[PDB]
Amino acid sequence: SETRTLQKIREATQELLKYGLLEEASKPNLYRIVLSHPEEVTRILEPLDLDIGIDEIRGLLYVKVRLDETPAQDEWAHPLVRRQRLNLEQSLLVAILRQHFVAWEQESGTGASQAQIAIDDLLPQLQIYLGDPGSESKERTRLLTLLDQLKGHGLVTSPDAHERIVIRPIIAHLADPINLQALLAWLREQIAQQT
Amino acid sequence: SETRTLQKIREATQELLKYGLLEEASKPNLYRIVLSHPEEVTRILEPLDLDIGIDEIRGLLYVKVRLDETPAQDEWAHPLVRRQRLNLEQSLLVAILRQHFVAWEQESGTGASQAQIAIDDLLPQLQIYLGDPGSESKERTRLLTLLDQLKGHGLVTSPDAHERIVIRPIIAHLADPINLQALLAWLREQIAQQT
Amino acid sequence: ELETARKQQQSLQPVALSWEKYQKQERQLADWLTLESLLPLWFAQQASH
Amino acid sequence: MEENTRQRTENYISAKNQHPAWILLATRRAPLVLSALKTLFEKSHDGIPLEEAIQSLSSILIEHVSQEQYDINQDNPFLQASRELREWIKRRLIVER
Amino acid sequence: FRRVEDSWREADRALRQSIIGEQYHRGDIVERLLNDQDALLNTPEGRVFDSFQQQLRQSSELKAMSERLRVILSHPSASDALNRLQRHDLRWLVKRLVDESQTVLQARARSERDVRGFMKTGLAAEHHRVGHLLNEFLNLALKLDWQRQMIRKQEVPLPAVGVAVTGIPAIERLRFKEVDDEAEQTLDLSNHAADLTQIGD
Amino acid sequence: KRMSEAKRVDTGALVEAGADLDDIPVYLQRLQELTEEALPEKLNRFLDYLNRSSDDGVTQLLSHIEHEVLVIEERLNELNETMFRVDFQPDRYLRLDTKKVVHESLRTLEKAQRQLNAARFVDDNGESHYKALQVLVAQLRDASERNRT
Amino acid sequence: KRMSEAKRVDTGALVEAGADLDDIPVYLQRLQELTEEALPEKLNRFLDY
Known part of the structure; x- marks a missing residue:
C-alpha cells in the first residue's frame, strides 16, 4: 500500500518512546536524525497526543503530553x-x-558540562533529612535502591x-520544581521542630 | 489550522495501544471507530513497526508486531x-x-465471550504435567500465579x-493453527535434544 | 452418547449399502455406452467384408 | 522360587531409597518427628484443620526446646512449626486436602 | 483400605493421562475405563472393597456388629484392655470404613467426569483441526521434565499478539509527596464516666 | 432419502456437508469412523458398569447418613452422662431419649430402596436396576434442590 | 429433498404419508388445507384469545 517511513526515523522514535528521551552525548545518531527530521517526528507523535520538547543547550530531547491545557479536567489524565x-x-x-544540578549550572553555565556528585556527599544529607x-551499609543500600x-x-x-554519579539533564524539565522547594522547606522545618 | 486527527480516532488508537487489544463486547464505540478507519490505524502504527490484526467474527482488534523488517530471531525483542x-x-x-475455548465455542458458536471455566476444572489437568x-492449597497457589x-x-x-475466569477471545489468535504447528515442531526438536 | 452412536451407525450403514449398489450400476453403464460407441465401427468392418 | 531370592533384595533396596516410611525411620531426627506427628493425629480422626495443626505443632515443639542436640528454636516456634509441616508435606508423610 | 485408596487413585490418574493420549478413539477410551475399573476390582484389595460393598447391601449385619461393639466397649474390662483412643477407634470402625470408601467412589466419579468430557465431542470442521493439533502438542508435553524449574521456564517461540504498549516514561508524569497535610488526628483516651439521670422514669 | 434421514439424527458432523453425490465421501467417512470406534457393542457393558458405580454411590451415601445418626446417638449418650453427675432436683436427673421419625419421605425412600434391592436379581441387562436407580436418584436430587422443606 | 424436509418439520399431519411422488397429492392437500382453512382458523382463534 503506502510507502515506508525511513528506518532511522522509526528506530529513533521507538527509542525515544522506550526511554522517554534522547541524549546527544549518548546516542548522537538518533538525536541528530530526529532533530533533522523534526516535522516528521512531531507528525508521527501528534495522533497519540505526544510531542517532543527539545533542548540544544543541554543536548536533551524528551516527550511531552500535547494535550491542550485543561481540556476536559482541571488536571489532565x-x-x-x-x-x-x-x-x-x-x-x-x-x-x-535538582538543587545541586541548578548550582552546577550556576558555576558552569547551563548545559555546558554534565553534573556529577559523590555518594559520600549525598549520604550525609539523607541521614540529615x-x-x-x-x-553506613544500610544507608548505602537505601541510596542504591x-x-x-x-x-x-x-x-x-x-x-x-x-562512587560518583551523573545527574541526567532531564531534571531541568521536571513538572513542578516549586513543589519540590516547598517540600524541602517543610523538611528543613521538620528537622528542626522534631528535635 | 494544523491537521489534527479526529479526536475519536486519536482516543481509540491511544487506548488500543494501551491495552494491546480492544473488544467489541467491552468498548464497542472505539472498536467500531477503528473498524471505520482501519487504514488510518495502519498509517498510525506503521512507523513504530506495529500493525493491526482484525477478527470481526469474534469482535476483537489486536495490535501485532509489523513483520516487514523486524528481526527474524523474535518480535519480542x-x-x-x-x-x-x-x-x-x-x-x-x-x-x-484453548482446548476449553474451542470446546465451548462448538456449542456457543462464535458468540460473545461467555467462555468461562471454573478454577477447579484446571487443577486436575495441570496436575498431570x-x-x-x-x-490442594499449594497447587491452587501455583495455578493462580x-x-x-x-x-x-x-x-x-x-x-x-x-473462582471463575473468562478466556479472552485473543487466545484463538495466540494459539491459531500456524502458531501451534510452529510450537509443536520446536517442542519436538527440544524433546529430540533431551534424548 | 453410546445410544446416539448406535442410531447414527444404523442410519449410515444403508447409505453405504445403496452407494455400492449405485457404483455397480455406474460401472454397468460406462462400459455399456462405450460398447455402444464401438458398435458402429464393428458393423462398418463387417459391412466392408 | 529363585527369583523370590534375588529380586527381593532389589525390592528392599528400592523401598529403602523410595518409600517415605523407611526414609523417615532412617533419618537422624526420626523419633521427634514421629512422636509429634502421633500426638497431632491421635486426638482427632477426621483430619486436622491446617491452622489448628500448626498451632498444636508449635505447642508441641515448644516442649522439645530442651533437647540440646536437635535444632533448638527460642525465637519463633510458630514459624518452625509452619516450616516443618510444609517439609513433611514435601516428604509425602502428610497430605492435605 | 488405606491402600485400596491409593490403588484407585493411581487408576484414575492413569486414565486421565491416557485421555490426553491421542491414539484413543472414543470407543478405546470407554474400553480403557471399563477394563481398568474391572481389573482394579479383581485385585485382592478390589475384592476387599467388593466384600465391603456386599456387606453394605446387607446392612443388617453391619448395624448388628456396631451395636455389639457398643455393648462390648461399655464393659469395665474394656478400659483395662484398651486406652481410650483405641476404644474410640474400635467403636467407630464401621463409620471409618463407610467414610473411607467415599474416596474410592470420588476417584471413580472423577474418571467418569473426564470420560464425559471426552465423549461428547461431535466436533465441527474448524474445531477438529485445532483439536488434533492441541492433542498432539499435549502428547508432546507429557515427555518433558516438569519438576525441573529450568524446563518450566523455557522461552517458547509463540507470536506476540495482544501486544500492549504503556508507560512511555515522559518526565512530566511525575508528581511528589504532598506532606503538607500536617493536621494530626487527635487522640481519645478519656473515660466516659456516665450519669444515669439522663434515662427516663 | 437415506442421506437426509442420516442428517435427521446428526450432531455437528454431517450438517457441515450437503446431501448430493459430492457429499457421499464425508458420509461414508463418518460411517467408517463410527464402525472403527465400535461404540454400540460396548453399550451392554457400560449399562452394567453405570448401574454398579451409581448404586455404590447411592448406597454409600444412604449408609453414611445412618451412621451419622448413630454418632448423634452417641453424643446424646454423652450428654446423659453429664446430667447424671448432677441433681436436677433432690432425687432426680434428666435423661434424653431419642426416637425415629415417621416422615412420609423416609417411607418413600425405604420403598424405593427395597425395590432397588429387588432389582439386582432380575436379569434384563440391568434395565430394571437402571429404572430403580433412576427413581432413587430422582428423590435424592429433588430433596437436594428444594432442601428447606 | 424438499418434501422430506417438510415431513421433518411436520408435527403429525404427514406421519401417515410417505416420501414419494404418489404422496404429492397428500402434500398438495395439506398445503391447500393449511392455507385456506387451518392458518385462517388458527389465526381467528388466536385473535379471539
Whole structure:
C-alpha cells in the first residue's frame, strides 16, 4: 500500500518512546536524525497526543503530553502515561539532585558540562533529612535502591569507579520544581521542630 | 489550522495501544471507530513497526508486531513491547485454555465471550504435567500465579467471586493453527535434544 | 452418547449399502455406452467384408 | 522360587531409597518427628484443620526446646512449626486436602 | 483400605493421562475405563472393597456388629484392655470404613467426569483441526521434565499478539509527596464516666 | 432419502456437508469412523458398569447418613452422662431419649430402596436396576434442590 | 429433498404419508388445507384469545 517511513526515523522514535528521551552525548545518531527530521517526528507523535520538547543547550530531547491545557479536567489524565507520585524519600532525592544540578549550572553555565556528585556527599544529607537506618551499609543500600529507581525514570546514571554519579539533564524539565522547594522547606522545618 | 486527527480516532488508537487489544463486547464505540478507519490505524502504527490484526467474527482488534523488517530471531525483542516472552508452563496453560475455548465455542458458536471455566476444572489437568505436591492449597497457589501471569498477557480475566475466569477471545489468535504447528515442531526438536 | 452412536451407525450403514449398489450400476453403464460407441465401427468392418 | 531370592533384595533396596516410611525411620531426627506427628493425629480422626495443626505443632515443639542436640528454636516456634509441616508435606508423610 | 485408596487413585490418574493420549478413539477410551475399573476390582484389595460393598447391601449385619461393639466397649474390662483412643477407634470402625470408601467412589466419579468430557465431542470442521493439533502438542508435553524449574521456564517461540504498549516514561508524569497535610488526628483516651439521670422514669 | 434421514439424527458432523453425490465421501467417512470406534457393542457393558458405580454411590451415601445418626446417638449418650453427675432436683436427673421419625419421605425412600434391592436379581441387562436407580436418584436430587422443606 | 424436509418439520399431519411422488397429492392437500382453512382458523382463534 503506502510507502515506508525511513528506518532511522522509526528506530529513533521507538527509542525515544522506550526511554522517554534522547541524549546527544549518548546516542548522537538518533538525536541528530530526529532533530533533522523534526516535522516528521512531531507528525508521527501528534495522533497519540505526544510531542517532543527539545533542548540544544543541554543536548536533551524528551516527550511531552500535547494535550491542550485543561481540556476536559482541571488536571489532565492521559491513557498511555501513568502519573506516578514518588514516595517521600524519592522526592527528597530528586529535590537534592535538582538543587545541586541548578548550582552546577550556576558555576558552569547551563548545559555546558554534565553534573556529577559523590555518594559520600549525598549520604550525609539523607541521614540529615530521614534519620539513621542503623549503619553506613544500610544507608548505602537505601541510596542504591533509590538510585536504581531513578535510573528507571532516566534521572540518574549508574555509580562509577569514583562512587560518583551523573545527574541526567532531564531534571531541568521536571513538572513542578516549586513543589519540590516547598517540600524541602517543610523538611528543613521538620528537622528542626522534631528535635 | 494544523491537521489534527479526529479526536475519536486519536482516543481509540491511544487506548488500543494501551491495552494491546480492544473488544467489541467491552468498548464497542472505539472498536467500531477503528473498524471505520482501519487504514488510518495502519498509517498510525506503521512507523513504530506495529500493525493491526482484525477478527470481526469474534469482535476483537489486536495490535501485532509489523513483520516487514523486524528481526527474524523474535518480535519480542521489539523496543516498545513491555511484557516478557511466554514460557512453556504458561504455554501449557494456554493450550489447555484453548482446548476449553474451542470446546465451548462448538456449542456457543462464535458468540460473545461467555467462555468461562471454573478454577477447579484446571487443577486436575495441570496436575498431570506439573505433578502432585500433595496439597490442594499449594497447587491452587501455583495455578493462580500462572493465571496472573497470563492475565498479564491478556489471555484471561482474573478470578471473579465464584473462582471463575473468562478466556479472552485473543487466545484463538495466540494459539491459531500456524502458531501451534510452529510450537509443536520446536517442542519436538527440544524433546529430540533431551534424548 | 453410546445410544446416539448406535442410531447414527444404523442410519449410515444403508447409505453405504445403496452407494455400492449405485457404483455397480455406474460401472454397468460406462462400459455399456462405450460398447455402444464401438458398435458402429464393428458393423462398418463387417459391412466392408 | 529363585527369583523370590534375588529380586527381593532389589525390592528392599528400592523401598529403602523410595518409600517415605523407611526414609523417615532412617533419618537422624526420626523419633521427634514421629512422636509429634502421633500426638497431632491421635486426638482427632477426621483430619486436622491446617491452622489448628500448626498451632498444636508449635505447642508441641515448644516442649522439645530442651533437647540440646536437635535444632533448638527460642525465637519463633510458630514459624518452625509452619516450616516443618510444609517439609513433611514435601516428604509425602502428610497430605492435605 | 488405606491402600485400596491409593490403588484407585493411581487408576484414575492413569486414565486421565491416557485421555490426553491421542491414539484413543472414543470407543478405546470407554474400553480403557471399563477394563481398568474391572481389573482394579479383581485385585485382592478390589475384592476387599467388593466384600465391603456386599456387606453394605446387607446392612443388617453391619448395624448388628456396631451395636455389639457398643455393648462390648461399655464393659469395665474394656478400659483395662484398651486406652481410650483405641476404644474410640474400635467403636467407630464401621463409620471409618463407610467414610473411607467415599474416596474410592470420588476417584471413580472423577474418571467418569473426564470420560464425559471426552465423549461428547461431535466436533465441527474448524474445531477438529485445532483439536488434533492441541492433542498432539499435549502428547508432546507429557515427555518433558516438569519438576525441573529450568524446563518450566523455557522461552517458547509463540507470536506476540495482544501486544500492549504503556508507560512511555515522559518526565512530566511525575508528581511528589504532598506532606503538607500536617493536621494530626487527635487522640481519645478519656473515660466516659456516665450519669444515669439522663434515662427516663 | 437415506442421506437426509442420516442428517435427521446428526450432531455437528454431517450438517457441515450437503446431501448430493459430492457429499457421499464425508458420509461414508463418518460411517467408517463410527464402525472403527465400535461404540454400540460396548453399550451392554457400560449399562452394567453405570448401574454398579451409581448404586455404590447411592448406597454409600444412604449408609453414611445412618451412621451419622448413630454418632448423634452417641453424643446424646454423652450428654446423659453429664446430667447424671448432677441433681436436677433432690432425687432426680434428666435423661434424653431419642426416637425415629415417621416422615412420609423416609417411607418413600425405604420403598424405593427395597425395590432397588429387588432389582439386582432380575436379569434384563440391568434395565430394571437402571429404572430403580433412576427413581432413587430422582428423590435424592429433588430433596437436594428444594432442601428447606 | 424438499418434501422430506417438510415431513421433518411436520408435527403429525404427514406421519401417515410417505416420501414419494404418489404422496404429492397428500402434500398438495395439506398445503391447500393449511392455507385456506387451518392458518385462517388458527389465526381467528388466536385473535379471539
